[PDB]
Curated annotation (Swiss-Prot):
Site location (Discriminates between blocked and unblocked aminoacyl-tRNA): 14
Organism: Vibrio cholerae serotype O1 (strain ATCC 39315 / El Tor Inaba N16961)
Protein name, per record: Peptidyl-tRNA hydrolase
EC supergroup of this enzyme: hydrolase
Function according to Swiss-Prot or TrEMBL: Hydrolyzes ribosome-free peptidyl-tRNAs (with 1 or more amino acids incorporated), which drop off the ribosome during protein synthesis, or as a result of ribosome stalling.
Similarity comment: family membership: Belongs to the PTH family.
One Gene Ontology term of the molecular function aspect: tRNA binding
Active site: 24 (proton acceptor)
Reactions the enzyme catalyzes: an N-acyl-L-alpha-aminoacyl-tRNA + H2O = an N-acyl-L-amino acid + a tRNA + H(+)
Gene name tied to this protein: pth
Amino acid sequence: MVSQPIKLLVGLANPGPEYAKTRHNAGAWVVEELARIHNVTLKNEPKFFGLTGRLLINSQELRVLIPTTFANLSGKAIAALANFYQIKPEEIMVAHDELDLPPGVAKFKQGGGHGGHNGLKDTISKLGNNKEFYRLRLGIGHPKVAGYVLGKAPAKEQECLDAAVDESVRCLEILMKDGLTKAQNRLHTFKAE
Ligand code: NA
């Protein structure tokens, strides 16, 4: 019935040099990487309010997106693009910095609460209040939250984050080549077992 459960992948972030390489852009790093690995450059597309791209993985189209809305307005980019290609929220995967998980940890999740990430709040809202999109939770720790989330991670910590990016990317490839379940199993065991 559904040979492709994930058709859109989004990476939340804030644009511009005053936010470059900050913790709150983790989601974007995952989109950047996955796109780099499939030789696609992202282009700004005004109608979708962000950097877009189409990736061919396992000979299926996976569309990617990094909004330029500013984080708390991410919903409008996501909705513009999903409405264009009639993509259900349930078919969307949103990578985002997650405070509730430590640096170096990544987890998938479907549905549920935003955990205070207003980016998620606004995404939920702009998808007709539907929570049931998938998430890729990139762990960034707790500590001052405004300062932390919009801060750069110290270098030892950054390599913890990059490892987690790397894993997330592997698990997204797996999701596309081998299915959702196999990717969910792999990430669930990550750092856990
Ligand atoms: Na960045």
